[PDB]
Amino acid sequence: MFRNNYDGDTVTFSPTGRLFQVEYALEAIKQGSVTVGLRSNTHAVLVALKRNADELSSYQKKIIKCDEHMGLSLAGLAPDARVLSNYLRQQCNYSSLVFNRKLAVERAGHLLCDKAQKNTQSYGGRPYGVGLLIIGYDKSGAHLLEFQPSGNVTELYGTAIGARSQGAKTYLERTLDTFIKIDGNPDELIKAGVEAISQSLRDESLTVDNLSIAIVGKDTPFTIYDGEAVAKYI
Amino acid sequence: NDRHPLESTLKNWETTQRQRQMEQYRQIFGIAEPMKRTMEMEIVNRTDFNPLSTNGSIHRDILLNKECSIDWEDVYPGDVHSKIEKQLGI
Amino acid sequence: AAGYDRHITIFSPEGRLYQVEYAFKATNQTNINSLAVRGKDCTVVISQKKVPDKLLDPTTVSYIFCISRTIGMVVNGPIPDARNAALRAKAEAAEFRYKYGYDMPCDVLAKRMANLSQIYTQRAYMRPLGVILTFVSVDEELGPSIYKTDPAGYYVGYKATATGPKQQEITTNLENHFKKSKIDHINEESWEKVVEFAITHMIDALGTEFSKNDLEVGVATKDKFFTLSAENIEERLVAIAEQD
Amino acid sequence: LQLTEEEKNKILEFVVSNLYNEQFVEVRVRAASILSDIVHNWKEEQPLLSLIERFAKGLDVNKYTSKERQKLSKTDIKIHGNVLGLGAIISAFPYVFPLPPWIPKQLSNLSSWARTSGMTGQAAKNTISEFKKVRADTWKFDRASFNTEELEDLEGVLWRSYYA
Amino acid sequence: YSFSLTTFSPSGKLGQIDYALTAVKQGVTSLGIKATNGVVIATEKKSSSPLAMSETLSKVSLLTPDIGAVYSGMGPDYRVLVDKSRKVAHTSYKRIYGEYPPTKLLVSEVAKIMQEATQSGGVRPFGVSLLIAGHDEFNGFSLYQVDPSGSYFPWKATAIGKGSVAAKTFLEKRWNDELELEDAIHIALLTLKESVEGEFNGDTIELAIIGDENPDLLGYTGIPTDKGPRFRKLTSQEINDRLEAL
Amino acid sequence: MFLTRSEYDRGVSTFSPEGRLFQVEYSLEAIKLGSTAIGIATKEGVVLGVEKRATSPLLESDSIEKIVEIDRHIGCAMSGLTADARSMIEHARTAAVTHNLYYDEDINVESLTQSVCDLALRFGEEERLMSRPFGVALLIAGHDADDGYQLFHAEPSGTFYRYNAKAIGSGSEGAQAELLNEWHSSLTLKEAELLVLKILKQVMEEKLDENNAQLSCITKQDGFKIYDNEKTAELIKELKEKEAAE
Amino acid sequence: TTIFSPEGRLYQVEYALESISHAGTAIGIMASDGIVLAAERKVTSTLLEQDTSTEKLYKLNDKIAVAVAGLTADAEILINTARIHAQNYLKTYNEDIPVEILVRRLSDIKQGYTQHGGLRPFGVSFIYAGYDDRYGYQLYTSNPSGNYTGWKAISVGANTSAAQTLLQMDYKDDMKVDDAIELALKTLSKTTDSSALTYDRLEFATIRKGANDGEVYQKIFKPQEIKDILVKTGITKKD
Amino acid sequence: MSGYDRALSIFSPDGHIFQVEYALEAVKRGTCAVGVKGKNCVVLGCERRSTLKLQDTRITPSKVSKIDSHVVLSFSGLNADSRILIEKARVEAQSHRLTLEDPVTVEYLTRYVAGVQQRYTQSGGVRPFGVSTLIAGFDPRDDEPKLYQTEPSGIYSSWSAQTIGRNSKTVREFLEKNYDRKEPPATVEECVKLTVRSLLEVVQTGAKNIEITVVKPDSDIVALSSEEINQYVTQIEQEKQEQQEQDKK
Amino acid sequence: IGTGYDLSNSVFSPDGRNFQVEYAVKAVENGTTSIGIKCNDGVVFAVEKLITSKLLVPQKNVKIQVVDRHIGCVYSGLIPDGRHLVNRGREEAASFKKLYKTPIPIPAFADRLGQYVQAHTLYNSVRPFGVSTIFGGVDKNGAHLYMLEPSGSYWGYKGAATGKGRQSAKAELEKLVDHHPEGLSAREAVKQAAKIIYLAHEDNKEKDFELEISWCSLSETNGLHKFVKGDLLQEAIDFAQKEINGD
């Protein structure tokens, strides 16, 4: 009853300048479980809800490490989230070998944009079906990047990605001054994320297995929590 | 080695002269010019397969500026399934 | 819509490449008329300059291109397709001068450019450029010269070729001058009278007077093709206004 | 256009009593797929409101805490048949353009079970995912017939191995 | 990968080549005649404007010093085939045998180029039919036609383009096996006088011959072994003098 | 019945308005059409089993072995066998041996599972992406020093989960319901064998015997072994007396 | 586009076979001491050069010949490939190419143009002829599919069915080359669409032994020699 | 994946009705090819279509094709394709020995053949081969007969007897009654007699249409001539007259 | 009987135009409003930056990009396409500087930038860039300001405006060039740029915003492109406010 002629190929433009396949690639983010990213002046944090397909089934991986100074969460396509995260780790190693720095996370953002925009511009492929929250810390402080798969990115104090994330997003937005100051007490920046992600659970509950937490600021490098590591944070 | 001084130079001459030309066009005209010229050559090479004919192509001699010039390589030149499963990947 | 026949360069039952016929409508997207003529020892190109917005810099609007020392062209069509074809023509002249040890003739550059247009006119994944190229020089072999090239890859010599959406009036006035004068060039010994003659024909054909900033000029003598500035055009407009 | 009102009634209570089959789970899902065909062919609303009431009686409540609503979804044939029966009603309505106001309300009860990670919630995820798929060509017009929180209750239904 | 062009239509026809013969059938006519001691090839020059200088648009072309060509169809397709045909004569045969190829070996090579354009993805077949005419020590004088298919044929006389069926009927009616080169020139000038779209004179008409050797046109003396060009392109004054004998 | 088609169905490398890839999703529905295969992981061994369709007597068994050795510590159950299933398994074999000769130790089962999923993302052998499906469902079972006894459902998508117990082929719903109602972290190897036979009995329609059912387990001590028909028979006899003992 | 019809049959091969079913008739006959090839040529053009040296019939080497039904443009690509293979075998083994090795060589190239979707198949059917020591006089046929078959007498192209019936009733295993001359001319006169057979409409050839023990000789007949076998046979369009 | 199973009516995914199914249709239309094992031989047999009166028999190819001194291949479906499929297998086996100091194993001649067939299925608008094959022989330094079937999809399987092509149901039905896997034909003569009985039920006319190759250990490959298979056909037809006249009424 | 001419990029419609390049400018027409003002010795760039949540990090989300060092760049429409065309420009100028040992002419950076964008209008294997660029700088010939389209068309300008507010912006740019025919100063262009931007934001009055401005003046910033901040920014904000609150 309302057929769209202009959403078959990634290279077509709508008569109104839309790239419909790319806007459909964003609707794949809404297919994942909620992850929340937030930062203070000195720490950035990721907290992620992990699904399973059955009660016998091991929960899905959500946080990935690229280097000691940055990593990411993935609410979108898991097998396509392995393509971007591989390329980001490859670029971290390229920076340590070819330039002897480590890849500042603004520069990591520019490289993900370039790679995703290439998929968005050429025939014989598809847009990436995944949104990334990248967190990192470098000479310019604590950093948090929302990569959206149209080939774009933005510097943000916090955000939520995945199904039912408008709840968690609105809690971060109503509780921002609360998390931006926290600094030298990183466990309250973790509890700030755990309140935010709890708003997207509609009487679902956090459990020791359902939830994963990752933090990267100052000396303490990028680390991930699972099982009882996240029991003190329930 | 025992192998003729000129052999490795003349083996790679056609590739070397075009690779050197594309770097001059990048330098004098910018990245757009060798990006245009490599995509024209890609369309011409990739859409022009015929297992029984190996004698170059008419449009590739126009593109390469070889339409009125003979080398010794043009007067002295040197399985259809094996060609098919190379053109498509095995 | 007839499927692929109208969207790629392939023959209709009739035998029409719709990719080429449509590229000839692209050349009139500028709404610009240009005129070229041969004198005794020069060839001249005059082109209508459109700068409607106050906000443009008229020094950056130009459809006239210097192709080498001795050869130059006007383009009819979109500026992105005119700058692409100018950059090819600059590279083709440079590589000919290296290979053959003498300056690239206008006839040879028009043929070389026309052979490139025949590719896009046969390969289904290549589209013909949306431009007409009007090369002019003073060749030591053919003296003053004019060669025109088009999206179909057909090129031929000329003594007063012109391209534009009002080109038929200019051409019909040129044909009537060459019919009465019977010489195949305008018999002026200096290029100033040739350009003035070429601005008298474009006024008379297009039904409008021109300011010094509403007109363009080209001057191809031996050893130099060059473009006039607005004050050199106004010297000619002043001499036209002094005569009539 | 062949059976009468006593034969279609026998067919209904047979397919509806196959929704509560105590031994087979494949005969409980098969029966929903056929109760959809019975319901699609109804021409008046009073039968459907009474079927909605029968299927909604085991549902449409906060009588269950999340741990009951979860453990009952792994075990309980009664609510399994009621969720399958209500999904059979929802999927009988693929292309009704102005979306009937009972559809958003009953989708709201199913989407409570869709979070419950077992056989009863599976029937609800399948119902909502099939619904969004048929309503994927109308969705800008149908998004107006739901609240903001109801549209979020429709979101996270695909528990596929490649969706994170 | 569903990739080819010029595939078979259910009645056993190639289709795209058929459309390529409709482009040939729309061109300004060209024709050729073989005589006892020479050959003639001829065509009209159609001006895009009377400001065009058709001393620049040659339609009749030298392939080797004893072989000529002319077309009907798309002239751009004919400028590109003629330069490959010239390259072929030198690279395949002159540089191995120190002598130019016959007019059956060069026609086969031109036809092989046009066949490869039918059996391809990515490329349309040519929009030209070529008449190739020439001389060789053992075959003697010859004339051939080549079509978009890559089919080539030996002809006693032929015509191609708009006026071709009326030209071919006149060529059947006038051809006999004892013609000489001055006779064949008159028959060819008569045939173009019926097919002409524009004005008829030495400036609008192209005409070439492969005849006797012309030692004047070799441009150097001292080597009788080298006989000098058989191919000669008639000057516009000769054409006007013969057009006064008409 | 009533039709329920969308416009996004049949899309290759395309997202629906929700993001749904419908080629890989319709491939994941084939886990109901195969012959039944079941896996049960425990602290003692991973018990794999498949229902046999009764063969022509002329078809010799080694042609259709749906429980297979990848390596001494890894094996696949398939619900259906295809050339692509043997392609996945022979890629897994070649991957397991190439790992052992490069890294001097036995492959981790997760890493083998990921390597067969990487084959599926490549579509065999340009950016490797999850757009189209490859092959069939594998239950990959194995044992390694780091992550113990593991059962993986490897899907046509190039993604997988570890399961404690998984059923694939035409018993999937009723089997997985009885598995999740019944599985313990206290299952012994013996009880895992009787559990897989009790599940098999209930789906198979037929009377369960050593000619319609097949068993295996991966054990760390014994390696992978497919079970002898006499051993499945004495286990099936033991199931009969366990239910008669009620 | 080289995809199967739902019966497991190739549309392009069937359309190439429709094309050759119009493409002029050719007969070959294998006598006890030589092979005959004959082909009927639709000369609807007066100005086409008859007494051109070939159109339907061609040499592949010093003891092998072909007749062509189909597109002559397609046939000449295969014919050159076969000529190159015959001389490359002679260069390698110092011995003349066996007929089976060459006929099937052209049957393997023609199958490849039927499998890959970028290639159209070749619209050609070949009636090969030749001698070698491995077998003796051999007559083979090959068609657009890449199928090939051995025969004692065969027709290809137009009017195959009428020609096969006429061959079948008059062919004898012990006949001589001059009986095969007569038979092939009779068959074509009993099959032709044209009112009567004549020397320019006819292409002819033979693969005899001659008088000298080492010889095998392939006279591809010039028009005047064909006029003599015409007037000897009783077809005899004579003054 | 076919017939009457249809949820809310139905619609098609990427799936079953496909190029490989139409290649299976081409295979079924090609002549009947059979193979049976014995105690210490394997016999492959084929249907010739009855040769035309003007066809040349002495040069007509033997339908069963030797790939190597110990391996034999026969087919149903497209002949041109089988010729291209036998060439690849023959050079693959000769290359095996040249690089492995080992003659090709029958199981490697079946995985290779079905393997190359699978690549022409996988992708590219290159079609799959319209061919199904029996591959039979012995490994070197062994006395076990082997017999494999391959299909256009690149699936392959081992059989102690099998049939492919036209009318193969009726042949497989006869083999299931006459081939006992405990006590297979104990002698070559009985193995050949079983293949002649098996083919006699499905061939067009008689001894013209059957042709057989017997493979034995240690490279003893042996085509049987028309005259040898005429004495088998005649002996089987003698036993039919004997069985009929041994009616008791 | 159909219009398949707009589905693909290497195709002319019947009138002889690339409809994908005509749809790619629609992506620019949705973009952020931005302008460049050309002075008597330099170029000013100004942008209205929409702040769709408070979370947007301050002074680190930036719409003005510094190509090379003596050139500035502001773009509108699809943001990923401007980033790609901004990174290629940086490569272009860095190549010229390593080879010719001088900064690239702005007229020459514009030509190399306009040939890369036209190349994506040639082939159906790629789509046009759905972004328009304003770029400009000071070189050895002084001040140049260019604007470049999805089509690859580019010209030099006295002032240029792009994105959503372009109508109101072009009408004010015309008032400037009419009142100041000789040209406006560096400090007069920053004040007047803020006035133009605030007046363009009157289309979207509810969507709160930030103003971001940059120099490239031979006298104020020694010919290098540089950011406008602090007191000169607040002096521009107050001029914009006192003239838009015109009571």
Author numbering:
A (entry chain F): 1 to 234
B (entry chain P): 48 to 125, 137 to 148
C (entry chain A): 9 to 252
D (entry chain O): 1980 to 2143
E (entry chain B): 5 to 250
F (entry chain E): 1 to 125, 130 to 250
G (entry chain C): 10 to 248
H (entry chain D): 1 to 249
What text appears in the publication on this structure?
The proteasome is an essential cellular complex responsible for selectively degrading proteins into short peptides. The proteolytic activity occurs within the CP, which adopts a hollow cylindrical shape, with two β-rings sandwiched between two α-rings. The assembly of the CP is assisted by three proteasome-specific assembly chaperone complexes: Pba1/Pba2 (PAC1/PAC2) , Pba3/Pba4 (PAC3/PAC4), and Ump1 (POMP). Blm10 (PA200 or PSME4)-bound mature CP functions in the ATP-independent degradation of short peptides and proteins with intrinsically disordered regions, contributing to spermatogenesis, gene regulation by degrading acetylated histones, and mitochondrial health 21–25.
Blm10:13S, which includes α1-α7, β2/β3/β4, and Ump1, was the most abundant complex and resolved to 2.84 Å resolution. Here, we report the cryo-EM structure of the Blm10:13S assembly intermediate to find mutually exclusive binding of Blm10 and Pba1/Pba2 to the 13S based on overlapping interaction surfaces at the α-ring and common binding of their HbYX motifs to the α5/α6 pocket. The Blm10 dome in Blm10:CP contains a large opening of 14 × 23.2 Å that is situated laterally above α2 and α3. In Blm10:13S this opening is substantially smaller, at 6.3 × 11 Å. This constriction is caused by Blm10 loops spanning Asp155-Asp166 and Gly221-Val238, which are ordered in the Blm10:13S structure, but missing in the Blm10:CP structure 29. Since the smaller opening in Blm10:13S would cause steric hindrance to the entry for an unfolded polypeptide, we refer to this configuration as in a closed state. In Blm10:13S there is a loss in electron density for α2 Met1 to Phe7, α3 Met1 to Phe13, and α4 Met1 to Phe18 resulting in an open gate. An open gate, however, might not enable activity for this complex because the Blm10 dome is closed. In the Blm10:13S structure, Blm10 is 34 Å away from Ump1 and does not have any direct interactions with the features of CP that are indicative of the immature form (Ump1 or propeptides).
